[PDB]
Amino acid sequence: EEKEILWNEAKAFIAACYQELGKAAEVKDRLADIKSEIDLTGSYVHTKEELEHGAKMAWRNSNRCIGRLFWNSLNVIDRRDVRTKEEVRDALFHHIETATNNGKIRPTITIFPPEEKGEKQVEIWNHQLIRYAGYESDGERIGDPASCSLTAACEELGWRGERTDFDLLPLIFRMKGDEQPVWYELPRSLVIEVPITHPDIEAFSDLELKWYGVPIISDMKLEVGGIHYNAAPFNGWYMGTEIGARNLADEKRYDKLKKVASVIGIAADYNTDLWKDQALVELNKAVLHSYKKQGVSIVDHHTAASQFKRFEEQAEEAGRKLTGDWTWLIPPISPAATHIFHRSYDNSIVKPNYFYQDKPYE
Amino acid sequence: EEKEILWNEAKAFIAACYQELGKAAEVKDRLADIKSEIDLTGSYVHTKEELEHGAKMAWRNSNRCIGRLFWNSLNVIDRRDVRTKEEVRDALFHHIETATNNGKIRPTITIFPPEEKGEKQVEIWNHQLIRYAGYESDGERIGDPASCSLTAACEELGWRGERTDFDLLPLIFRMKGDEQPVWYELPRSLVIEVPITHPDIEAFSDLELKWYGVPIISDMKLEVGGIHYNAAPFNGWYMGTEIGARNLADEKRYDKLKKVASVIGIAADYNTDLWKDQALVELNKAVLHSYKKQGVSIVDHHTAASQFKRFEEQAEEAGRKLTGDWTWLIPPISPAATHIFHRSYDNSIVKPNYFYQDKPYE
Numbered sequence: 001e002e003k004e005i006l007w008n009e010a011k012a013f014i015a016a017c018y019q020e021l022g023k024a025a026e027v028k029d030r031l032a033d034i035k036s037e038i039d040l041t042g043s044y045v046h047t048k049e050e051l052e053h054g055a056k057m058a059w060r061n062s063n064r065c066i067g068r069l070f071w072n073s074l075n076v077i078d079r080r081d082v083r084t085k086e087e088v089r090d091a092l093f094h095h096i097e098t099a100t101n102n103g104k105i106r107p108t109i110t111i112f113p114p115e116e117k118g119e120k121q122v123e124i125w126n127h128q129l130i131r132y133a134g135y136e137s138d139g140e141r142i143g144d145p146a147s148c149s150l151t152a153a154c155e156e157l158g159w160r161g162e163r164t165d166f167d168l169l170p171l172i173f174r175m176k177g178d179e180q181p182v183w184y185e186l187p188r189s190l191v192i193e194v195p196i197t198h199p200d201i202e203a204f205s206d207l208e209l210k211w212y213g214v215p216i217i218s219d220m221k222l223e224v225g226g227i228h229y230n231a232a233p234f235n236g237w238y239m240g241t242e243i244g245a246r247n248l249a250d251e252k253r254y255d256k257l258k259k260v261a262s263v264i265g266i267a268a269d270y271n272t273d274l275w276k277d278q279a280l281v282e283l284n285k286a287v288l289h290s291y292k293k294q295g296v297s298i299v300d301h302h303t304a305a306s307q308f309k310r311f312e313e314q315a316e317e318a319g320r321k322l323t324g325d326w327t328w329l330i331p332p333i334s335p336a337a338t339h340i341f342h343r344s345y346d347n348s349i350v351k352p353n354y355f356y357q358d359k360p361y362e
Numbered sequence: 363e364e365k366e367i368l369w370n371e372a373k374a375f376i377a378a379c380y381q382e383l384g385k386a387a388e389v390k391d392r393l394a395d396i397k398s399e400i401d402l403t404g405s406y407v408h409t410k411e412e413l414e415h416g417a418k419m420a421w422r423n424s425n426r427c428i429g430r431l432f433w434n435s436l437n438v439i440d441r442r443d444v445r446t447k448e449e450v451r452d453a454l455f456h457h458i459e460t461a462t463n464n465g466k467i468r469p470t471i472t473i474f475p476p477e478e479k480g481e482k483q484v485e486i487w488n489h490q491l492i493r494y495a496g497y498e499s500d501g502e503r504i505g506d507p508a509s510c511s512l513t514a515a516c517e518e519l520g521w522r523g524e525r526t527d528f529d530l531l532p533l534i535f536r537m538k539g540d541e542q543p544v545w546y547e548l549p550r551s552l553v554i555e556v557p558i559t560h561p562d563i564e565a566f567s568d569l570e571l572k573w574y575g576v577p578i579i580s581d582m583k584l585e586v587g588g589i590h591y592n593a594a595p596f597n598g599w600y601m602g603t604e605i606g607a608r609n610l611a612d613e614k615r616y617d618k619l620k621k622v623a624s625v626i627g628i629a630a631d632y633n634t635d636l637w638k639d640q641a642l643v644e645l646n647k648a649v650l651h652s653y654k655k656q657g658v659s660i661v662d663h664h665t666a667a668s669q670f671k672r673f674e675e676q677a678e679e680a681g682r683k684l685t686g687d688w689t690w691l692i693p694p695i696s697p698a699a700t701h702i703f704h705r706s707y708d709n710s711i712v713k714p715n716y717f718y719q720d721k722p723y724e
């Protein structure tokens with residue numbers, strides 16, 4: 001019946017995929033082959049065309065992503081051939097280099113071997129391939145609180161962070177058949193970072209803020225036609241509010257709004273002064289300016305929502321229903337200044353798609 | 363069976379109301395009386411205590427309101443005695459005067475006779491008792507677009523607006539048995555308005571903006587224990603974002619952000635400059651400053667969310683489940699700077715409550 005779930009998902013995906021690719025006449029023969037393959041082996045293997053179009057459909061179906069206009073130009077790297085930890089490590093280094101593209105970011109996904117019987121072949125422990133460490137030791141908070149748990153697990157395995165506020169975590173992943181994950185320090189030449197400065201306020205550099213160029217999510221499973229690719233990291237470029245309203249501003253993250261208020265010269269004393277809102281706007285302006293100045297791709301939330309509107313129009317023109325999660329699509333600053341705020345969205349789950357999965361620590 | 367819906371809602375309300383009022387032993391006798399009264403007359407009449415506590419429960423159950431901490435201090439005015447249009451007009455003038463309270467706003471509801479067999483006794487055409495007119499005549503837009511339809515209906519009945527951007531609409535309501543509503547101009551001495559100025563930027567007054575002091579909603583039905591009070595206007599004080607992010611900023615309302623940008627001296631040319639977000643913050647700061655300076659009650663969205671957090675805590679302490687609509691509770695500026703953004707809310711409908719109802723025009 002697990003086998004039954006597979007065939008049913010398989011029928012649905014192939015029919016849809018081949019219809020979109022102009023190959024509907026080949027559906028019959030392909031499903032035949034697949035049915036025999038499940039019969040004998042307990043699974044089936046995607047063609048390169050299937051896998052590529054499946055990852056692109058999965059992005060197109062991600063209800064929580066404002067960035068979907070560009071779903072059809074996803075760069076897909078097929079690494080179902082990897083068998084060793086060195087090959088996995090090298091494929092991850094490669095994804096970083098090719099996605100970064102000297103700052104002109106290319107949306108990319110690298111796909112590793114799928115689960116076999118719910119049994120992972122490769123288990124990545126990172127939440128993003130590039131992320132900062134976090135520490136908490138009797139009172140003292142250093143770095144990114146969101147990474148405390150993973151940082152502690154790494155330090156169990158013999159790594160030691162320098163305890164700056166921006167230590168890069170090592171890649172950490174376990175292979176099927178190994179008891180402990182291995183880890184590898186990232187080579188700094190592969191990692192672009194951006195110092196945060198403000199276009200008008202010189203003192204803003206006194207805060208000594210920075211962020212990394214490319215968010216490479218490695219904590220989600222790609223599901224395509226009943227095959228579960230648990231290890232399949234993917235990246236876009238940032239929308240500036242993710243850095244300036246959330247990573248740098250949230251009280252449970254870097255918590256910088258009182259420091260931002262002080263450097264832009266406003267009091268942080270009275271709710272009615274709206275100092276938090278003012279500080280959020282100047283911090284977000286600094287983040288966009290800084291990425292643009294350094295030649296690293298980024299989009300502001302107004303341009304992003306306009307692109308998303310085109311995505312909605314495109315879907316209607318193609319006869320496809322649109323699904324979305326309004327609570328994630330609205331940006332955290334000036335949401336009502338976007339068209340998204342003023343309409344509603346059907347939050348149904350459609351596959352192929354990406355699904356969150358929790359880590360072995362945690 | 364309509365009679366059956368009534369008794370069932372009646373049983374539920376009395377039991378709950380009397381439990382909260384420490385009167386649970388009187389439930390049996392009261393329900394008995396009520397059952398006979400429905401038997402004979404097709405309905406029942408609330409005691410003054412029931413009606414007052416019911417309106418207060420209905421506020422406490424309004425999922426979309428961030429202001430519910432103060433539900434138990436609602437001022438309830440019982441006007442189930444009115445029979446003429448002059449009495450209705452005078453009760454509405456009175457609500458304005460007593461709610462305004464010289465600027466120290468008192469949350470108030472005036473309750474008129476309920477529907478009898480779905481038959482209204484009094485039908486108020488206004489959406490708020492104080493609101494600005496709107497006009498559109500081949501290209502030319504004047505005043506509040508949200509009021510175009512109602513403004514046109516009034517001008518059918520012989521009223522004529524001066525066609526400023528801030529004409530006050532007349533009260534307009536129909537009585538049972540009359541074919542046409544009547545209308546009455548508001549006396550300006552009852553209506554507080556606030557000129558919008560900025561605490562730091564002198565030029566802001568060049569925009570010649572103003573808003574009215576008190577939002578008095580007259581477009582909703584109060585439902586209490588199966589009795590439908592369609593005419594029951596109620597007011598709070600404003601949260602500043604309602605004026606500055608929505609009434610004055612929205613493209614389909616007064617649409618002032620490009621004018622705000624020009625007067626605060628920033629360019630309105632590039633999405634990445636975040637000029638809309640900057641203009642929204644300065645406009646919202648001006649609205650709070652201006653209401654405070656004039657001595658008219660208002661709350662900022664940060665203080666409001668903190669009060670709402672106390673409302674959540676109070677509900678837990680009392681053993682009551684909390685219901686809310688996250689999509690309306692988050693403020694339209696800096697939503698993620700409030701605790702509301704970071705939790706989830708059960709959007710179930712609980713009665714007594716307030717329910718939207720559409721107008722005869724429209």
Ligand code: HEM
Pocket residue numbers: 055059062064065066067068070074107108109234235236237238239242299304328354356
């Ligand atoms: C190309 C530029 C891209 C931008 C600007 C963009 C923007 C975003 C943003 C702003 C979010 C919400 C984050 C939050 O509010 O917490 C998000 C979520 C998401 N995006 Fe995109 N995205 C892009 C590319 C991609 C790509 C290439 C994929 C996959 C192939 C993807 C899949 C998703 C998914 C699955 C989520 C939900 C993540 C979760 O539940 O934790 N996005 N995106």
Ligand code: HEM
Pocket residue numbers: 417421424426427428429430432436469470471596597598599600601604661666690716718
């Ligand atoms: C005392 C100060 C009050 C404040 C600051 C307040 C604040 C607000 C705000 C900000 C909204 C959302 C408006 C929007 O985003 O579109 C709202 C909605 C609402 N409030 Fe309150 N409120 C207060 C008092 C009251 C009172 C006294 C009642 C009734 C007795 C009430 C019942 C409601 C209802 C029913 C809605 C939903 C309206 C709709 O669906 O159109 N509120 N409130």
Ligand SMILES: Cc1cc(N)nc(CCc2cncc(CCc3cc(C)cc(N)n3)c2)c1
Pocket residue numbers: 215217234235236237238239242356
């Ligand atoms: C490809 C991509 C591009 C982009 N610009 N942003 C994103 C958003 C990434 C992102 C960053 N911080 C936090 C999250 C949420 C993490 C998260 C956590 C939990 C518990 C569940 C769940 N579904 N998701 C997501 C992804």
Ligand SMILES: Cc1cc(N)nc(CCc2cncc(CCc3cc(C)cc(N)n3)c2)c1
Pocket residue numbers: 577579596597598599600601604718
């Ligand atoms: C008592 C009260 C106090 C306060 N500070 N704000 C409010 C919000 C009033 C308000 C103002 N503009 C617009 C709306 C929404 C009107 C509205 C329209 C439709 C179609 C449905 C529906 N449920 N509601 C509500 C009410």
Ligand SMILES: C[C@H](O)[C@H](O)[C@H]1CNc2nc(N)[nH]c(=O)c2N1
Pocket residue numbers: 326341342343344689690691
């Ligand atoms: C249904 C959809 O979410 C709709 O556009 C809502 C958005 N949330 C809202 N939130 C508030 N505060 N006021 C509104 O009028 C609306 N309309």
Ligand SMILES: C[C@H](O)[C@H](O)[C@H]1CNc2nc(N)[nH]c(=O)c2N1
Pocket residue numbers: 327328329688703704705706
């Ligand atoms: C379930 C609840 O709405 C939750 O707090 C959400 C709020 N919406 C969100 N929106 C974004 N963009 N990112 C998040 O991580 C969350 N968490």
Ligand SMILES: [Cl-]
Pocket residue numbers: 215242247
């Ligand atoms: Cl991030």
Ligand SMILES: [Cl-]
Pocket residue numbers: 577604609
């Ligand atoms: Cl209003």
